[PDB]
Structure formats: structure tokens, C-alpha cells
Amino acid sequence: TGLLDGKRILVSGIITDSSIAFHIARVAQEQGAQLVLTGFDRLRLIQRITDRLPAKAPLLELDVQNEEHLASLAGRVTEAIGAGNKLDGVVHSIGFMPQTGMGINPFFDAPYADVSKGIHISAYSYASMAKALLPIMNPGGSIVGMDFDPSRAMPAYNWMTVAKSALESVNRFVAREAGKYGVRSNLVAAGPIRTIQLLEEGWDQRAPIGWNMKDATPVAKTVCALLSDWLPATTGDIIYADGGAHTQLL
Amino acid sequence: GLLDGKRILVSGIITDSSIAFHIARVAQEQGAQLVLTGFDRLRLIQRITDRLPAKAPLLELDVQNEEHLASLAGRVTEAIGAGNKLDGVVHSIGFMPQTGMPFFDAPYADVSKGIHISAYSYASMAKALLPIMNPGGSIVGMDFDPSRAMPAYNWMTVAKSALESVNRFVAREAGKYGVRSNLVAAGPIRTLAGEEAGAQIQLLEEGWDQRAPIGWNMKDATPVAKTVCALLSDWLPATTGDIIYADGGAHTQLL
Amino acid sequence: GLLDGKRILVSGIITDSSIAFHIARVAQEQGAQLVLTGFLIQRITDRLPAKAPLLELDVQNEEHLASLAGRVTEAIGAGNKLDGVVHSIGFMPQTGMGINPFFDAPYADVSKGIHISAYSYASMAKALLPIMNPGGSIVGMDFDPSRAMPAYNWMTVAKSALESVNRFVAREAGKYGVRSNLVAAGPIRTGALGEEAGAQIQLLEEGWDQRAPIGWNMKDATPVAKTVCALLSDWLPATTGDIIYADGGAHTQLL
Amino acid sequence: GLLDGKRILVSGIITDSSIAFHIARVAQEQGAQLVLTGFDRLRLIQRITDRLPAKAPLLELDVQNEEHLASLAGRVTEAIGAGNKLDGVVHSIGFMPQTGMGINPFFDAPYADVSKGIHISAYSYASMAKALLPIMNPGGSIVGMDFDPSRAMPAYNWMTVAKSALESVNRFVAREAGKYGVRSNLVAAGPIRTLGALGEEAGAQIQLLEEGWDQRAPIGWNMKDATPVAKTVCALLSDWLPATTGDIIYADGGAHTQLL
Ligand SMILES: NC(=O)c1ccc[n+]([C@@H]2O[C@H](COP(=O)([O-])OP(=O)(O)OC[C@H]3O[C@@H](n4cnc5c(N)ncnc54)[C@H](O)[C@@H]3O)[C@@H](O)[C@H]2O)c1
Ligand SMILES: NC(=O)c1ccc[n+]([C@@H]2O[C@H](COP(=O)([O-])OP(=O)(O)OC[C@H]3O[C@@H](n4cnc5c(N)ncnc54)[C@H](O)[C@@H]3O)[C@@H](O)[C@H]2O)c1
Ligand SMILES: NC(=O)c1ccc[n+]([C@@H]2O[C@H](COP(=O)([O-])OP(=O)(O)OC[C@H]3O[C@@H](n4cnc5c(N)ncnc54)[C@H](O)[C@@H]3O)[C@@H](O)[C@H]2O)c1
Ligand SMILES: NC(=O)c1ccc[n+]([C@@H]2O[C@H](COP(=O)([O-])OP(=O)(O)OC[C@H]3O[C@@H](n4cnc5c(N)ncnc54)[C@H](O)[C@@H]3O)[C@@H](O)[C@H]2O)c1
Ligand SMILES: CNC(=O)CN(Cc1ccc(F)cc1)C(=O)C[C@H]1CC[C@@H](NC(=O)c2nnn(Cc3ccccc3)c2C)CC1
Ligand SMILES: CNC(=O)CN(Cc1ccc(F)cc1)C(=O)C[C@H]1CC[C@@H](NC(=O)c2nnn(Cc3ccccc3)c2C)CC1
Ligand SMILES: CNC(=O)CN(Cc1ccc(F)cc1)C(=O)C[C@H]1CC[C@@H](NC(=O)c2nnn(Cc3ccccc3)c2C)CC1
Ligand SMILES: CNC(=O)CN(Cc1ccc(F)cc1)C(=O)C[C@H]1CC[C@@H](NC(=O)c2nnn(Cc3ccccc3)c2C)CC1
What we know:
The structure is a homotetramer.
Chain A: E1 8-12, H1 20-30, E2 34-39, H2 43-50, E3 59-61, H3 67-81, E4 87-92, H4 112-133, E5 137-147, H5 158-179, E6 184-190, H6 197-206, H7 217-227, E7 237-241
Parallel strand pairs in A: 1-2, 1-4, 2-3, 4-5, 5-6, 6-7
The complex binds nicotinamide-adenine-dinucleotide (4 copies) and ligand S72 (4 copies).
One ligand S72 binds next to α6 of chain B.
């Protein structure tokens, strides 16, 4: 009697048990989903983190910058879920921006090689993952990616804010492609999660229902709502799981 | 069910084509216990609500009537039982006289009545019902994206722009009770409501299904009803003062 | 001069701190010939650098609106038309803006506020478009209402309605080859509400200058008057139904 | 003139149909003293800049070339004279290979092509501001060209993504430019006929996208004419929008404000 009973869902982005993807995976399993997980570089380490989830799930390697990993992804997922079975959901919870482009480094001092790598991993890969997986997705399916509202500039986030602005645009185009398969594509724009202090503290102040940066469960639940059959007419869009902070000036 | 055990008030049923009728039907299929509110044609509304899968008390509510608003919480408490509170409230009410739906020829008395019913009443209903809502509760109102002007919708577009602003303020008040307030912006639905405006609205409708990456079926209110039920559930707990678009993704595409 | 030879109507002067006073002053410095409307004001308008006829205009008065074009034609001379119109009018009773809880504003007060602050932008365009030249410009004053905030309450709702009205006025004005736009200004200084509200409104103001990349001086209306004159000029000829922000860039920054 | 005595750098001229050519022409008609920058085909660009109403020095600038960016301020100072600074900077540069914009499926654009397009179309707005802010006067203005990317559309594909990135870059450039008392803004223009080549199907789709624009625009939209766009850029370069920064001004006939 779970929200995602019987659904086959791929979840990328687990690195620690504080990863937003770890909480998404935990809630999806509690709700009856059968998962396939993807990890980057430190696969033995990631496998040990995935052992903390309530149910066993196969772990596949996926470096989104690696064309060979993307070319073989659908075949490897099909081995994991069984021939004749397809995915009902895909979760993109991947991001990266070198220290030259996010933090205390001046915005103007980020070399383009660093910005390009960050945009490749954080934005272009949302299209790459949809390209690889839409041929193995069922109608009524759902692709969800993680976002941080980039509509206004802010301290420190710098080039990662630019990568999120690009990701929002990529999501609208992925929705055009996914619609051909009867699949939805949406982003969840979350408030800050402890996975800068003054900026982050502003969310709880503005949020009419408050914001707890130490609690990823409300974000995971929102992703699961989009993976469910309960938002069937929403695509190319952004759902804000931020306590309502973006709707208030002060 | 998605809403098992939840006590939810649903306003705005007039016909079985009303978006509120479909919201009520889906909510009951999902285990919710409803309280319904109707305006003016109560005997007629009772014949329509007899078509729902489960019985529900029907209370009169004219949002322009201060006495109805002053007594609403007490009448709802009588219907659900002393000691019980609401978990959800659905505002599915709108009105704009014909004059407001040429743009310049709408008299202010007509525009004011339309804004009272379509936008101010969202605050009126929250004021009356928040004192009888449980923490984790949810208030949901119906919207039609008014970010851009369009043919014929005219002053009702202005009322929706005011409603979006009212929703952001209601969220500030509702938060004090641990309650969320959000709007669902739906695509056009064939509910009961000249040649020029007729042709323009036909073009607006056709364009909607063309732009929507997953298409849009104006004869099917179920996807909209499901979206309202998602907001009434425990599955969007960090969303408030916001707008969820149940429009096939049409607003995200230019062509 | 930026506005050399242009005939421009300017509403909204009540004191020499009114944003409309600064708009009128800058427009005259830039060579415009003005017609002023107000609703005692002659002593204030005598402080402008040049003489200008002052006509009475209560935007809630249907007779004033019906006779406005004829009265303006008498003032500027038969055979002459207006090139610009400035709406710098706003009103909200203390029940709807200030310290009063959002839920305690009666609709009669909110409706009067929306009539004067939003509907009148359409009323003024209806009255004046028949006497405007092609290439003309209508400009109204706005305060960004995209997010809720303390104290502004129902005046925020009136601005949300005004932004929607501006998009529809642009549709009508386009038929005459006239543009319609709003200038969304930062706060301008045009303990009276208590210690608590005073501190909250002070924080709202300090944050504005903090967020604005070029800063924001609440005591200086000249950057706002210059922005309105840019829209009245021939230099933004392809902008209509839109909003230009003269707020130091504060709305583009989170912190 | 609106820009009398102002020293303004204008990048992006390649043909006399370039939006930058019209921005330069209007700026000179309004009394500005220009410095022009061009990419790769400098001899060809000089023949085009001879068509402007006044002479202006032409400097080479490939925005992907770190050496050109490192020497730019010094070369501009030589052109305008020691002790003089710029009052304006216009970025009117964009590029996206055919794999990322046109008829090619959105999913078939390789990242090397997308990355080159984002480097030239978005990151270079920050590169140019970094190089030129040290030689800009207080009250100065940086303006870049945009095409509203808030909604997806046919064919524009990854160039839409590059514009979404550019809008975000503009908000961060405004934070840096403010330290110098300089504004940074974008002008989002409607479609302009700059330089059946893409086939019947795509041709009809792009034609519908264009016609819809003049239909939506309450004052209409003339796709042949960059002058209303050039005038809008000059308004931002002037002293008449002194409190606008990190922002976007739409010179699109009001099309983006109307659904139909
Ligand atoms: N932490 C927050 O405050 C916050 C708020 C809103 C949105 N988000 C977003 O949520 C997502 C997850 O971030 P997180 O906070 O959980 O941090 P995280 O560090 O736990 O997760 C980021 C993941 O990206 C993966 N990744 C990096 N390079 C990759 C590559 N080449 N191929 C594949 N995967 C790669 C990492 O291995 C890691 O699992 C990101 O998109 C982030 O931007 C985070
Ligand atoms: N039909 C669509 O295309 C569409 C699209 C998006 C949003 N909506 C919105 O959905 C909501 C419901 O509209 P609908 O299309 O189902 O039409 P409807 O006619 O079935 O419902 C409108 C309801 O408003 C009620 N109402 C009017 N005046 C009232 C008053 N004084 N007090 C109380 N109730 C009053 C009517 O009695 C009726 O039940 C409205 O907010 C509407 O704007 C409709
Ligand atoms: N911080 C601010 O002061 C600020 C910021 C942004 C925008 N604005 C807007 O600028 C405009 C002018 O406001 P202001 O700050 O100069 O204040 P103000 O009090 O000087 O101007 C308001 C004007 O509205 C007029 N008005 C009221 N009722 C009227 C009626 N029935 N008929 C005709 N005119 C009527 C008043 O006579 C007055 O001239 C308003 O739209 C306001 O919302 C103000
Ligand atoms: N044409 C339209 O419909 C339209 C609409 C809105 C915005 N815009 C924007 O206006 C700007 C100018 O485009 P246009 O339509 O005038 O086309 P264009 O081809 O005439 O201008 C593009 C310019 O970018 C230059 N450029 C490319 N690579 C470069 C590099 N490595 N270094 C330096 N410069 C480089 C080219 O040499 C050329 O001068 C672009 O930002 C474009 O996106 C165009
Ligand atoms: C070897 N070098 C890395 O491997 C670069 N590194 C490590 C690192 C980056 C920045 C930093 F300073 C410290 C450490 C990354 O690539 C980490 C990723 C993790 C996933 C993504 N993470 C977020 O998007 C995210 N992290 N924190 N926040 C909150 C926030 C809000 C506002 C301002 C600042 C922060 C967000 C929204 C993108 C960055
Ligand atoms: C007697 N006179 C009234 O009693 C006015 N009447 C009845 C009536 C209206 C129009 C009409 F011809 C005939 C009758 C109303 O006040 C009904 C309400 C019902 C609830 C609300 N309904 C919508 O908001 C709604 N109705 N249709 N659409 C689609 C659409 C989209 C864009 C443009 C046009 C249409 C919408 C979005 C607001 C109007
Ligand atoms: C003659 N009796 C009326 O006519 C009532 N009165 C006069 C009055 C009201 C309050 C007060 F104590 C003293 C005087 C009005 O109705 C004033 C109008 C003037 C024009 C409009 N004014 C603004 O829109 C405006 N005023 N202040 N701010 C800054 C701000 C920002 C955020 C929060 C709070 C403040 C704004 C944006 C709308 C209100
Ligand atoms: C003649 N030049 C280009 O072909 C040259 N190449 C390479 C190329 C060659 C052949 C080809 F076959 C496609 C692309 C460019 O990379 C030029 C740049 C110029 C600056 C930028 N240009 C625009 O941004 C721009 N160009 N057209 N439009 C209107 C529009 C709107 C919506 C959909 C489609 C079109 C826009 C908004 C981006 C492209």
C-alpha cells in the first residue's frame, strides 16, 4: 500500500548517507519502489553506503562525462531489472563545480575549463541521462532532477548558480523529448540541506512553514510525489520544496 | 488511500463538470471524509452531490455573505463532530460578470464583485477555517495562469493575478498553524462557462494541447483533481505560498 | 531635451515629495509641455520650473473620466494630441496596509484601494487613448509584488492586479500605436506605526540598499523620474505591456 | 545626442545585418565615440565598419583567446588615449554549432559543441566585464544581447540553454560591476533577420515561430529591422536608466507579455 508500489526507479547521486539521493532512495523503498542505483568513481565506498538502505538494490557505475558508460547504461539497467522490464522513474541528483567557481574564489577568477566541467556534470548530464534511459522507460514514467533556485544571484554559489540556470532550461527541452514516450520531466528546487551560513539561515526566516536544513525527508517526499501517478499533468516544470521561502521577500 | 482518514472541506460544486466535483470524487476514492459547501442553488447542488461515491454533508456558503463566513467554522464543527478538525480546504470558486469577460467597458462594480468572489474570498475562507485546521493541513485554491494577457479572459485574468498575490499572504498566516497554502494552475477545462472571442478561445484551446509536451485533454478534469489531492496529501510537505501547474506543461513551452 | 515638444499628462501630484512631482520636474527640464491632474495642489504645482494647466481628476468619479479628454483638448489646443500619460496614483486604507492583520481588512476598504490603484490605470487609458498620437507612451508606477512582504499587505495585491491590468491596457493601446508600461521603483521616502512595525520596515529598507549592486537611496526620487522619462521618450520603442525596474537591481539579488 | 561624448566599446560586428552594426550606427548618430572589436575576419569586418557614419578603431578579440582578453584593456587604452576610460561596453556575441541549434535532435548535440557555444555565448560576458571594468568610468554601462529563454521552443535548442546561462551570468556581473559604479543589463530582442536552407519541415516551424511574434506583439514586430533593438541598447548605455542593473529589458514588441 505504498505510494510507489511496483515501480522500477533508477536513483543516481548517492555518495554519503547525507546525500539527498540517499534520502530519496530510502523514502522510495519505504513506499514500495524497486530501485537501481548509479554511482560515480568510488563504487566500493558507495556500495557500503547503499547497504544502509532498508532493501538491497543493484549498484551500477555511471560517470556522466564518460560516453562509454552512457552508451552501455540501458543494457546494464536491463540486466539489473530483467529482460522485458522497463523503468517507471529516473532521479538525477548529480552536481559538481570546482572550488574556483563556487565558494570564496572571486566569480571572475574561475577558468572556463572548470566552469565547463561543472556545467557538463550539473546540467548537460540531465539531457544525457534522459537520452540513455527514455528508450527503456514506460509510458506514465517520470524523470526528476535536483535544482537550487537560480532566478536571483547570491553570494558564494557563483558558477553553480549559472549551471542551475542552464539545468532549468535543459529540463524544458528534455520534457519535449520525454513527452514522445508519455514520460514527464521535472525539477525539485530544494532549500539548503547540510550534505554561506547567513545566506542559508535566511530560508528558515522567510519560509512561512519554516525550513530545517538538517532534514532532507521533505525534499525526498517531494521527489517521490513527482515519481508517483499523482502529478500526471506536470512537465518541463519546477516544484519548490523550500518551505515557501522563494515566495517571500522577508 | 492517499487521503485515508483526512477531513476535507470542498467548495465550488455546481455541476458534475465542476472541477470541484472531480476533486471531491478523487478525494473520496482516496479515503477522505468530506464536508461540501455550495452557493445559492442548494437543492440543485444536493442532486449533483448525490452522484459522488460517498455521502457528505452540504453546507451553504456565499463568500460575499459575512454572516455565512462568521458561522462557517461552527457549522463545519457540527458536521465533523466536536473535538475534530479539518486537514484540508479546497477553494474552487470563481465569478466575473459578462462585461468583464471590450476590456474598457467593464464597470468597476462588476470587476469588484468578480475580485471579491475570485480572489479576496481565498483570504476570507482561510480566516474562517484556519482556527479549525490541524497541523500538517493544506489549503488549495484553483488558478488559471495570468502571467501574460490573453483574449476574452480580461478582468478574470486580473482577478487571478490578485488571487496569486493573496495566496502568498495566506501562506504567511497559515504557517502559524503548521498549514500550507497553494494554488493549482490548471489548463482549460470544458466546464459550463460573440464570434470574435469564440474563435480566439478556440485557438487558445488548440494551442494548449499543441504546446503541452504530454498533451492536454480539456474534457478530462481528473489530472487536475489528482494534482489537488497531491497537495492535500502529506507528500508535498515543504511547499507553500506556491503554484503547481497541472496544464500538460504548456506554460513551459513557447510553441 | 529628451522630451522636446512632447505633450504629456501627469497625474498624482499631492506634495513636492510625490514621485509625480519629480517626474513632472524632470519632464519639463527635458522640454515637455505638461497637463497636470490632481484630486491646494496648485500651490505645489507652482513649484515646478514651468507653468502647466491643472485639471481635476478623481479616478473614482465617472463624470470626471467622461469629460477628461475634452478638458485636456481645451488645455492643449484643438488639433493637438498627447504624446504621454503618467499614472502615479495609489491608495490603500490603514485596514489594508500597515500594522492591521492581513485578515482584518474589510472588502469595502480593499475594493476602494484596488479601484484607485489598479482599475484606474485602465480608466485613464480608456479616457486618453482617443487623444493620443501614434508613438505615444502610457507609464504607471509599480512596487514589485511578486513575493509577499510585511506591512504592504493588500497594497501588494493591488500592485499584482495593476501589473495584470497593464498587460491588457497594452493590447488596447497598441491599436493606437501607443505603448503601456510600468516602472517598478524601490522604496522612496514620500515611528508613526510603533516600535515593532517600524523596525521591520527599517529592515525591509536597509536590505534593499544592501542587495542593490549599485545601491539604493530612498531619499532620492530622481533615478525613478529619469526612468519614467526614458519610457516616455522614443528610446524604448519596442517595449510594451512590460515592467522596467528602477530599484538599484535589488530584485535581481537574493542577498 | 543621447550619448554625446561617451566612449563605448562595441563587439559583435560581422556583417551590416549584425545587431552590433545597428547598435554602433545608432550610438554614433547619438554622439558616441566608439572602439570596435572583431573576430577572425578582421579585413572583412573593416570593410563593413567603413559603412558606419563615423570612423572607429577596430581591435581583434576572440573571446576564447586568453591572450586577447589579457591585452584588451591595454589595447583599448591605446585606442582612446591614456587617461581616458570607457563609459559603455556592448556584448553582441553568440555562437552555437549546427549540432546544437537547427534541425539536429536536441539529444544529438555532443558536449564539446555545447561547451564551445556556452563559452562564446555566456561565459564571455563575464570575461569581457573582467577585462574592461578596470578601464570603465563610474556611471558606466555594460549591455549584452539576449533572446528570452524562459520557455523551450523548436530549433533554438542548446542556444536557448546558453541564453539561460547568460541571464544568470549577467546577474553576477552586476554584483562585480556595482563596485565600479557600473550597471550590467541584457536586452532580450525579438527575432531579427540576420545571416529554406534547413528544409521544408523546420522552415515552416521557424516561420510559424516568427509570425506568432508579430501576432502577439501589441505594437507589432518587424523582423527585418534591428533599429528598435539598437535604440533600446542605447537607452541602457545612456544616463536615463540609472537605477537598473542585473536586469533584462525586452525589445520584442511586447510579445513575451501576451499568450495569444
Ligand atoms: N545540498 C543542498 O543544499 C542542495 C540544495 C538544492 C539542490 N541540491 C542538488 O541536489 C543534488 C545532490 O547534491 P547533494 O547536496 O546531495 O550532494 P552530494 O555531494 O551528496 O551529491 C552530488 C553527487 O554528484 C555526483 N557526481 C559528481 N560528479 C559526477 C559524475 N561525473 N558523474 C556522476 N555523478 C557525479 C557525486 O558523486 C555525488 O553523488 C545536486 O544536483 C545539488 O546541486 C543540493
Ligand atoms: N474551467 C477552466 O478552464 C478553469 C481553468 C483553471 C482554473 N479554473 C478555476 O477553477 C475554479 C472552479 O471553476 P470551474 O471551471 O469548475 O467552474 P464552475 O462554474 O463549475 O465553478 C465555479 C463555482 O464558483 C461558485 N461561486 C460563485 N460565486 C460564489 C459565491 N458568491 N460564493 C461561493 N461560491 C461561489 C459557483 O457556485 C461554482 O460552484 C475557479 O476558480 C476557476 O477560475 C477553471
Ligand atoms: N516607496 C514608494 O513611495 C513607492 C515605491 C514604488 C512605487 N510607488 C507608487 O508611486 C505612485 C505614487 O505614490 P507616491 O509615493 O508618490 O505617493 P503620493 O501619496 O505622493 O501619490 C499618490 C497619489 O495618488 C493620488 N490619488 C489618491 N486617490 C486618488 C483618486 N481618487 N483620484 C486621483 N488621484 C488619487 C493622491 O492624490 C496622490 O497624488 C503610487 O502608484 C505608488 O504605489 C511608490
Ligand atoms: N538574430 C536574432 O534573431 C537575435 C535575437 C535576439 C538576440 N540575438 C543575439 O544578438 C547577438 C548578436 O547576434 P546577431 O543576430 O547579430 O548575429 P551575428 O552573426 O551577426 O553576430 C554574432 C557575432 O558573434 C561573433 N563571435 C562568434 N564567435 C566569437 C568569438 N570566438 N569571439 C568573438 N566574437 C565571436 C561573430 O563574429 C559575430 O560578429 C547574439 O548574442 C545573439 O544571440 C539575436
Ligand atoms: C574537488 N572539488 C570538488 O569536488 C568540488 N565540490 C566540492 C565543494 C564545492 C564547493 C565548496 F564550497 C566546497 C566543496 C563539489 O563539486 C561539490 C558539489 C556537491 C553537489 C552540488 N551542491 C550544491 O548544489 C549545494 N551544496 N551546498 N549548497 C548550499 C549552498 C547555497 C548557497 C551557497 C552555497 C551553498 C548547494 C545548493 C554542487 C557542488
Ligand atoms: C451570467 N453571468 C455570470 O454568472 C458570469 N459567469 C458565467 C458565464 C461566464 C462566461 C460565459 F460565456 C457565460 C456564462 C461566471 O462568472 C462563471 C465563472 C465560472 C468559474 C470561473 N471560470 C474560469 O475561470 C474559466 N472558465 N473558462 N475558462 C477557460 C477560458 C480560458 C481563457 C479564456 C476564456 C476561458 C476558465 C479559465 C470564472 C467564471
Ligand atoms: C490622505 N489619505 C490617504 O490617501 C491614505 N494614504 C496616505 C497615508 C497612508 C499611510 C500613512 F502612514 C500615511 C499617509 C494612502 O493611501 C497612501 C498611498 C500612497 C501611494 C501608495 N504608496 C506606496 O505604494 C508606498 N508607500 N510606501 N511604500 C514603501 C513601503 C514598502 C513596503 C512596505 C511598506 C511601505 C510604498 C511602496 C499607496 C498608499
Ligand atoms: C549565419 N549565422 C549562423 O548560422 C552561423 N552560426 C553557425 C551556424 C552555421 C550554419 C547553420 F546552419 C547554423 C549555425 C552561428 O552560430 C551564428 C550565431 C549568431 C548569434 C546567435 N543567433 C541567435 O541567437 C539567433 N539567430 N537567429 N535567431 C532567431 C531564431 C529564434 C528561434 C529559433 C531559431 C532562430 C536567434 C535568436 C547564435 C548563432
